[PDB]
A = this chain, B = another copy of it.
């Protein structure tokens, strides 16, 4: 679920404030996305966007108002490492991993202040 993602990032990047940091960054971190990611962190976001698009195509998973962000799963955060509970159902397991993958992704990528609030109508 969205509230769990922010907390997974905080989990992964202790020194961060996701809302502020990754929202409206590059071409993909933020609602929608278009064009080609402007950097590596942005590509992390694009890849997550795509994860959620796949999720949506699981004929067996039918998310509330078709929004995967609405699905709550079970994960643990212990000293920088994220684990998705193995008891999550197949749909939850799937969203869990998209989130987990994005967080690690964000962790290892270089952040560019320049790319925050970009003029997407022009560079994406």
Contacts and interface: CB of A to CB of B under 8 A. Distances in A.
Interface in A56-70: 60-62, 64, 70
Given A60-B64, A61-B64, A71 B89 contact: yes
A1 interface: yes
A72 interface: yes
Copies of the polypeptide in the assembly: 2
Interface size class of A (residues with CB under 8 A): 10 to 19
Contact of A74 (B72, B90, B91): B72
Nearest to A3: B87
Interface of A: 1, 3-4, 60-62, 64, 70-74, 85, 87-92
22 contacts: A1-B74, A1-B87, A1-B88, A1-B89, A3-B87, A4-B74, A60-B64, A61-B64, A62-B62, A64-B89, A64-B90, A64-B91, A70-B89, A71-B89, A72-B72, A72-B73, A72-B74, A72-B85, A72-B87, A72-B88, A72-B89, A72-B92
